[PDB]
């Protein structure tokens, strides 16, 4: 995130960190059993980390569960990046609590000018 | 904008959904109906490498997935996101079958 600010600890409870040795991509918990992400983030082995704020320290509120199934969209296109979505099923259901919560899917599409909040541990420069 | 540095702490950014003409003006012949632009045309505020797959939540609903762009925070190159509102059925269908 370039030009952003540091989020309040656990203020984005649906934010997960995809880990394969180190954090490589973000994701969102939309179900106690399912995480949604970007198909271009695909790796055959992935560990999902929930309840994270500082990815470099065990603060205590984290739950690490390996993905059991990773399903990218059948029409995902690597050239155009059309249908850049992937679903990940956890091997064990996450325990929903204060620092770990699901995010609602959309009721409808958003009108232009709608303010949104974007988060992640990506490059800041 | 220039350089590199992946944070240990979670970063946030408030940005508005851009109209598809503004989105389409920035990337001629490359924006599909399954894509939306969110951000600022002036640059300086954007998602980047490592934020991929991350949430774009507006009004309590997940409207986007960090997908792509030309670099990060470039003037007139806002970020492009997967349009989640077009995928609810696939997501429900998939969760039911697996
Ligand atoms: Ca931590």
PDB file of N, CA, C and O in Angstrom, chain A residues 21-73:
ATOM      1  N   UNK A  21       6.150 -19.655   3.418  1.00  0.00           N
ATOM      2  CA  UNK A  21       7.503 -19.459   3.905  1.00  0.00           C
ATOM      3  C   UNK A  21       7.564 -18.028   4.378  1.00  0.00           C
ATOM      4  O   UNK A  21       8.092 -17.728   5.456  1.00  0.00           O
ATOM      5  N   UNK A  22       7.020 -17.138   3.546  1.00  0.00           N
ATOM      6  CA  UNK A  22       6.930 -15.709   3.845  1.00  0.00           C
ATOM      7  C   UNK A  22       5.616 -15.238   3.237  1.00  0.00           C
ATOM      8  O   UNK A  22       4.988 -15.977   2.482  1.00  0.00           O
ATOM      9  N   UNK A  23       5.143 -14.077   3.673  1.00  0.00           N
ATOM     10  CA  UNK A  23       3.904 -13.494   3.162  1.00  0.00           C
ATOM     11  C   UNK A  23       4.068 -13.172   1.679  1.00  0.00           C
ATOM     12  O   UNK A  23       5.031 -12.486   1.296  1.00  0.00           O
ATOM     13  N   UNK A  24       3.145 -13.643   0.843  1.00  0.00           N
ATOM     14  CA  UNK A  24       3.245 -13.327  -0.564  1.00  0.00           C
ATOM     15  C   UNK A  24       2.037 -12.578  -1.120  1.00  0.00           C
ATOM     16  O   UNK A  24       2.197 -11.766  -2.029  1.00  0.00           O
ATOM     17  N   UNK A  25       0.853 -12.798  -0.540  1.00  0.00           N
ATOM     18  CA  UNK A  25      -0.369 -12.146  -0.999  1.00  0.00           C
ATOM     19  C   UNK A  25      -1.373 -11.992   0.128  1.00  0.00           C
ATOM     20  O   UNK A  25      -1.199 -12.579   1.195  1.00  0.00           O
ATOM     21  N   UNK A  26      -2.374 -11.148  -0.100  1.00  0.00           N
ATOM     22  CA  UNK A  26      -3.410 -10.913   0.884  1.00  0.00           C
ATOM     23  C   UNK A  26      -4.592 -11.766   0.501  1.00  0.00           C
ATOM     24  O   UNK A  26      -4.522 -12.502  -0.479  1.00  0.00           O
ATOM     25  N   UNK A  27      -5.689 -11.629   1.240  1.00  0.00           N
ATOM     26  CA  UNK A  27      -6.880 -12.402   0.976  1.00  0.00           C
ATOM     27  C   UNK A  27      -7.966 -11.935   1.927  1.00  0.00           C
ATOM     28  O   UNK A  27      -7.691 -11.098   2.788  1.00  0.00           O
ATOM     29  N   UNK A  28      -9.185 -12.454   1.786  1.00  0.00           N
ATOM     30  CA  UNK A  28     -10.309 -12.065   2.665  1.00  0.00           C
ATOM     31  C   UNK A  28     -11.098 -13.285   3.085  1.00  0.00           C
ATOM     32  O   UNK A  28     -11.390 -14.160   2.264  1.00  0.00           O
ATOM     33  N   UNK A  29     -11.500 -13.294   4.353  1.00  0.00           N
ATOM     34  CA  UNK A  29     -12.300 -14.380   4.914  1.00  0.00           C
ATOM     35  C   UNK A  29     -13.754 -14.016   4.688  1.00  0.00           C
ATOM     36  O   UNK A  29     -14.216 -12.980   5.153  1.00  0.00           O
ATOM     37  N   UNK A  30     -14.475 -14.843   3.957  1.00  0.00           N
ATOM     38  CA  UNK A  30     -15.880 -14.546   3.679  1.00  0.00           C
ATOM     39  C   UNK A  30     -16.743 -15.658   4.255  1.00  0.00           C
ATOM     40  O   UNK A  30     -17.961 -15.673   4.104  1.00  0.00           O
ATOM     41  N   UNK A  31     -16.100 -16.546   4.991  1.00  0.00           N
ATOM     42  CA  UNK A  31     -16.764 -17.711   5.500  1.00  0.00           C
ATOM     43  C   UNK A  31     -15.747 -18.315   6.479  1.00  0.00           C
ATOM     44  O   UNK A  31     -14.549 -18.073   6.346  1.00  0.00           O
ATOM     45  N   UNK A  32     -16.206 -19.069   7.470  1.00  0.00           N
ATOM     46  CA  UNK A  32     -15.283 -19.646   8.432  1.00  0.00           C
ATOM     47  C   UNK A  32     -14.426 -20.714   7.749  1.00  0.00           C
ATOM     48  O   UNK A  32     -13.354 -21.085   8.238  1.00  0.00           O
ATOM     49  N   UNK A  33     -14.874 -21.164   6.585  1.00  0.00           N
ATOM     50  CA  UNK A  33     -14.163 -22.186   5.832  1.00  0.00           C
ATOM     51  C   UNK A  33     -13.524 -21.739   4.514  1.00  0.00           C
ATOM     52  O   UNK A  33     -12.768 -22.501   3.910  1.00  0.00           O
ATOM     53  N   UNK A  34     -13.841 -20.525   4.061  1.00  0.00           N
ATOM     54  CA  UNK A  34     -13.357 -20.029   2.763  1.00  0.00           C
ATOM     55  C   UNK A  34     -12.779 -18.625   2.722  1.00  0.00           C
ATOM     56  O   UNK A  34     -13.331 -17.685   3.317  1.00  0.00           O
ATOM     57  N   UNK A  35     -11.664 -18.525   1.992  1.00  0.00           N
ATOM     58  CA  UNK A  35     -10.920 -17.288   1.766  1.00  0.00           C
ATOM     59  C   UNK A  35     -10.952 -16.974   0.259  1.00  0.00           C
ATOM     60  O   UNK A  35     -10.927 -17.893  -0.579  1.00  0.00           O
ATOM     61  N   UNK A  36     -11.113 -15.700  -0.086  1.00  0.00           N
ATOM     62  CA  UNK A  36     -11.110 -15.320  -1.501  1.00  0.00           C
ATOM     63  C   UNK A  36      -9.845 -14.506  -1.767  1.00  0.00           C
ATOM     64  O   UNK A  36      -9.399 -13.727  -0.909  1.00  0.00           O
ATOM     65  N   UNK A  37      -9.254 -14.724  -2.938  1.00  0.00           N
ATOM     66  CA  UNK A  37      -8.021 -14.054  -3.316  1.00  0.00           C
ATOM     67  C   UNK A  37      -7.912 -13.817  -4.838  1.00  0.00           C
ATOM     68  O   UNK A  37      -8.909 -13.783  -5.529  1.00  0.00           O
ATOM     69  N   UNK A  38      -6.693 -13.571  -5.314  1.00  0.00           N
ATOM     70  CA  UNK A  38      -6.353 -13.337  -6.716  1.00  0.00           C
ATOM     71  C   UNK A  38      -5.763 -14.609  -7.353  1.00  0.00           C
ATOM     72  O   UNK A  38      -4.767 -15.174  -6.866  1.00  0.00           O
ATOM     73  N   UNK A  39      -6.331 -15.030  -8.466  1.00  0.00           N
ATOM     74  CA  UNK A  39      -5.856 -16.218  -9.154  1.00  0.00           C
ATOM     75  C   UNK A  39      -4.373 -16.163  -9.542  1.00  0.00           C
ATOM     76  O   UNK A  39      -3.701 -17.214  -9.626  1.00  0.00           O
ATOM     77  N   UNK A  40      -3.848 -14.957  -9.748  1.00  0.00           N
ATOM     78  CA  UNK A  40      -2.425 -14.787 -10.110  1.00  0.00           C
ATOM     79  C   UNK A  40      -1.492 -14.940  -8.904  1.00  0.00           C
ATOM     80  O   UNK A  40      -0.279 -14.752  -9.023  1.00  0.00           O
ATOM     81  N   UNK A  41      -2.088 -15.251  -7.753  1.00  0.00           N
ATOM     82  CA  UNK A  41      -1.377 -15.457  -6.500  1.00  0.00           C
ATOM     83  C   UNK A  41      -1.159 -16.939  -6.242  1.00  0.00           C
ATOM     84  O   UNK A  41      -0.565 -17.309  -5.227  1.00  0.00           O
ATOM     85  N   UNK A  42      -1.640 -17.774  -7.167  1.00  0.00           N
ATOM     86  CA  UNK A  42      -1.561 -19.220  -7.065  1.00  0.00           C
ATOM     87  C   UNK A  42      -0.196 -19.815  -6.727  1.00  0.00           C
ATOM     88  O   UNK A  42       0.833 -19.420  -7.273  1.00  0.00           O
ATOM     89  N   UNK A  43      -0.236 -20.788  -5.822  1.00  0.00           N
ATOM     90  CA  UNK A  43       0.914 -21.547  -5.334  1.00  0.00           C
ATOM     91  C   UNK A  43       0.216 -22.832  -4.943  1.00  0.00           C
ATOM     92  O   UNK A  43      -0.929 -22.801  -4.493  1.00  0.00           O
ATOM     93  N   UNK A  44       0.870 -23.963  -5.141  1.00  0.00           N
ATOM     94  CA  UNK A  44       0.249 -25.236  -4.803  1.00  0.00           C
ATOM     95  C   UNK A  44       0.190 -25.449  -3.284  1.00  0.00           C
ATOM     96  O   UNK A  44      -0.667 -26.183  -2.759  1.00  0.00           O
ATOM     97  N   UNK A  45       1.082 -24.767  -2.575  1.00  0.00           N
ATOM     98  CA  UNK A  45       1.140 -24.884  -1.129  1.00  0.00           C
ATOM     99  C   UNK A  45       0.978 -23.489  -0.554  1.00  0.00           C
ATOM    100  O   UNK A  45       1.682 -22.557  -0.936  1.00  0.00           O
ATOM    101  N   UNK A  46       0.035 -23.350   0.362  1.00  0.00           N
ATOM    102  CA  UNK A  46      -0.253 -22.064   0.976  1.00  0.00           C
ATOM    103  C   UNK A  46      -0.715 -22.248   2.423  1.00  0.00           C
ATOM    104  O   UNK A  46      -1.458 -23.186   2.725  1.00  0.00           O
ATOM    105  N   UNK A  47      -0.254 -21.384   3.314  1.00  0.00           N
ATOM    106  CA  UNK A  47      -0.709 -21.397   4.698  1.00  0.00           C
ATOM    107  C   UNK A  47      -1.441 -20.070   4.912  1.00  0.00           C
ATOM    108  O   UNK A  47      -0.896 -19.008   4.599  1.00  0.00           O
ATOM    109  N   UNK A  48      -2.686 -20.134   5.382  1.00  0.00           N
ATOM    110  CA  UNK A  48      -3.466 -18.929   5.616  1.00  0.00           C
ATOM    111  C   UNK A  48      -3.243 -18.422   7.056  1.00  0.00           C
ATOM    112  O   UNK A  48      -3.256 -19.205   8.003  1.00  0.00           O
ATOM    113  N   UNK A  49      -2.957 -17.131   7.216  1.00  0.00           N
ATOM    114  CA  UNK A  49      -2.738 -16.565   8.544  1.00  0.00           C
ATOM    115  C   UNK A  49      -3.741 -15.485   8.842  1.00  0.00           C
ATOM    116  O   UNK A  49      -3.767 -14.442   8.183  1.00  0.00           O
ATOM    117  N   UNK A  50      -4.582 -15.770   9.831  1.00  0.00           N
ATOM    118  CA  UNK A  50      -5.650 -14.893  10.245  1.00  0.00           C
ATOM    119  C   UNK A  50      -5.312 -14.258  11.566  1.00  0.00           C
ATOM    120  O   UNK A  50      -4.428 -14.744  12.283  1.00  0.00           O
ATOM    121  N   UNK A  51      -5.993 -13.163  11.882  1.00  0.00           N
ATOM    122  CA  UNK A  51      -5.740 -12.476  13.139  1.00  0.00           C
ATOM    123  C   UNK A  51      -4.417 -11.738  13.218  1.00  0.00           C
ATOM    124  O   UNK A  51      -3.976 -11.331  14.299  1.00  0.00           O
ATOM    125  N   UNK A  52      -3.817 -11.501  12.058  1.00  0.00           N
ATOM    126  CA  UNK A  52      -2.522 -10.808  11.953  1.00  0.00           C
ATOM    127  C   UNK A  52      -2.546  -9.297  11.913  1.00  0.00           C
ATOM    128  O   UNK A  52      -3.455  -8.699  11.346  1.00  0.00           O
ATOM    129  N   UNK A  53      -1.582  -8.683  12.587  1.00  0.00           N
ATOM    130  CA  UNK A  53      -1.391  -7.246  12.451  1.00  0.00           C
ATOM    131  C   UNK A  53       0.090  -7.120  12.067  1.00  0.00           C
ATOM    132  O   UNK A  53       0.412  -6.700  10.959  1.00  0.00           O
ATOM    133  N   UNK A  54       0.975  -7.523  12.976  1.00  0.00           N
ATOM    134  CA  UNK A  54       2.424  -7.522  12.748  1.00  0.00           C
ATOM    135  C   UNK A  54       2.763  -8.941  12.268  1.00  0.00           C
ATOM    136  O   UNK A  54       2.668  -9.930  13.039  1.00  0.00           O
ATOM    137  N   UNK A  55       3.013  -9.083  10.969  1.00  0.00           N
ATOM    138  CA  UNK A  55       3.309 -10.393  10.409  1.00  0.00           C
ATOM    139  C   UNK A  55       4.629 -10.967  10.849  1.00  0.00           C
ATOM    140  O   UNK A  55       4.853 -12.164  10.716  1.00  0.00           O
ATOM    141  N   UNK A  56       5.476 -10.127  11.429  1.00  0.00           N
ATOM    142  CA  UNK A  56       6.791 -10.561  11.874  1.00  0.00           C
ATOM    143  C   UNK A  56       6.911 -10.945  13.337  1.00  0.00           C
ATOM    144  O   UNK A  56       7.991 -11.306  13.783  1.00  0.00           O
ATOM    145  N   UNK A  57       5.812 -10.870  14.080  1.00  0.00           N
ATOM    146  CA  UNK A  57       5.820 -11.240  15.494  1.00  0.00           C
ATOM    147  C   UNK A  57       4.539 -11.953  15.890  1.00  0.00           C
ATOM    148  O   UNK A  57       3.418 -11.519  15.506  1.00  0.00           O
ATOM    149  N   UNK A  58       4.641 -12.984  16.724  1.00  0.00           N
ATOM    150  CA  UNK A  58       3.488 -13.706  17.229  1.00  0.00           C
ATOM    151  C   UNK A  58       2.951 -12.887  18.404  1.00  0.00           C
ATOM    152  O   UNK A  58       3.504 -12.917  19.495  1.00  0.00           O
ATOM    153  N   UNK A  59       1.865 -12.165  18.154  1.00  0.00           N
ATOM    154  CA  UNK A  59       1.227 -11.293  19.130  1.00  0.00           C
ATOM    155  C   UNK A  59       0.242 -12.071  19.993  1.00  0.00           C
ATOM    156  O   UNK A  59      -0.282 -11.550  20.986  1.00  0.00           O
ATOM    157  N   UNK A  60      -0.074 -13.282  19.544  1.00  0.00           N
ATOM    158  CA  UNK A  60      -0.968 -14.148  20.280  1.00  0.00           C
ATOM    159  C   UNK A  60      -2.343 -14.394  19.703  1.00  0.00           C
ATOM    160  O   UNK A  60      -2.901 -15.470  19.890  1.00  0.00           O
ATOM    161  N   UNK A  61      -2.874 -13.413  18.982  1.00  0.00           N
ATOM    162  CA  UNK A  61      -4.212 -13.510  18.391  1.00  0.00           C
ATOM    163  C   UNK A  61      -4.341 -14.193  17.020  1.00  0.00           C
ATOM    164  O   UNK A  61      -5.438 -14.203  16.452  1.00  0.00           O
ATOM    165  N   UNK A  62      -3.278 -14.854  16.554  1.00  0.00           N
ATOM    166  CA  UNK A  62      -3.244 -15.493  15.241  1.00  0.00           C
ATOM    167  C   UNK A  62      -3.699 -16.937  15.160  1.00  0.00           C
ATOM    168  O   UNK A  62      -3.560 -17.690  16.109  1.00  0.00           O
ATOM    169  N   UNK A  63      -4.163 -17.340  13.981  1.00  0.00           N
ATOM    170  CA  UNK A  63      -4.596 -18.711  13.750  1.00  0.00           C
ATOM    171  C   UNK A  63      -4.007 -19.083  12.408  1.00  0.00           C
ATOM    172  O   UNK A  63      -4.300 -18.424  11.418  1.00  0.00           O
ATOM    173  N   UNK A  64      -3.131 -20.077  12.366  1.00  0.00           N
ATOM    174  CA  UNK A  64      -2.545 -20.486  11.090  1.00  0.00           C
ATOM    175  C   UNK A  64      -3.167 -21.802  10.695  1.00  0.00           C
ATOM    176  O   UNK A  64      -3.050 -22.780  11.432  1.00  0.00           O
ATOM    177  N   UNK A  65      -3.818 -21.834   9.534  1.00  0.00           N
ATOM    178  CA  UNK A  65      -4.476 -23.048   9.035  1.00  0.00           C
ATOM    179  C   UNK A  65      -4.062 -23.219   7.584  1.00  0.00           C
ATOM    180  O   UNK A  65      -4.048 -22.253   6.825  1.00  0.00           O
ATOM    181  N   UNK A  66      -3.667 -24.425   7.205  1.00  0.00           N
ATOM    182  CA  UNK A  66      -3.272 -24.651   5.826  1.00  0.00           C
ATOM    183  C   UNK A  66      -4.510 -24.751   4.949  1.00  0.00           C
ATOM    184  O   UNK A  66      -5.595 -25.119   5.419  1.00  0.00           O
ATOM    185  N   UNK A  67      -4.343 -24.391   3.682  1.00  0.00           N
ATOM    186  CA  UNK A  67      -5.415 -24.487   2.706  1.00  0.00           C
ATOM    187  C   UNK A  67      -5.493 -25.962   2.366  1.00  0.00           C
ATOM    188  O   UNK A  67      -4.477 -26.652   2.344  1.00  0.00           O
ATOM    189  N   UNK A  68      -6.709 -26.448   2.162  1.00  0.00           N
ATOM    190  CA  UNK A  68      -6.966 -27.835   1.816  1.00  0.00           C
ATOM    191  C   UNK A  68      -7.343 -27.925   0.347  1.00  0.00           C
ATOM    192  O   UNK A  68      -7.186 -28.959  -0.287  1.00  0.00           O
ATOM    193  N   UNK A  69      -7.872 -26.838  -0.188  1.00  0.00           N
ATOM    194  CA  UNK A  69      -8.310 -26.828  -1.567  1.00  0.00           C
ATOM    195  C   UNK A  69      -8.150 -25.401  -2.051  1.00  0.00           C
ATOM    196  O   UNK A  69      -8.454 -24.469  -1.320  1.00  0.00           O
ATOM    197  N   UNK A  70      -7.615 -25.240  -3.256  1.00  0.00           N
ATOM    198  CA  UNK A  70      -7.387 -23.921  -3.864  1.00  0.00           C
ATOM    199  C   UNK A  70      -8.041 -24.011  -5.236  1.00  0.00           C
ATOM    200  O   UNK A  70      -7.668 -24.851  -6.042  1.00  0.00           O
ATOM    201  N   UNK A  71      -9.060 -23.197  -5.473  1.00  0.00           N
ATOM    202  CA  UNK A  71      -9.803 -23.223  -6.728  1.00  0.00           C
ATOM    203  C   UNK A  71      -9.823 -21.875  -7.466  1.00  0.00           C
ATOM    204  O   UNK A  71     -10.545 -20.939  -7.094  1.00  0.00           O
ATOM    205  N   UNK A  72      -9.025 -21.781  -8.522  1.00  0.00           N
ATOM    206  CA  UNK A  72      -8.985 -20.571  -9.325  1.00  0.00           C
ATOM    207  C   UNK A  72     -10.159 -20.610 -10.335  1.00  0.00           C
ATOM    208  O   UNK A  72     -10.678 -21.686 -10.666  1.00  0.00           O
ATOM    209  N   UNK A  73     -10.585 -19.442 -10.799  1.00  0.00           N
ATOM    210  CA  UNK A  73     -11.699 -19.336 -11.743  1.00  0.00           C
ATOM    211  C   UNK A  73     -11.328 -19.994 -13.061  1.00  0.00           C
ATOM    212  O   UNK A  73     -10.350 -19.617 -13.689  1.00  0.00           O
TER     213      UNK A  73
END
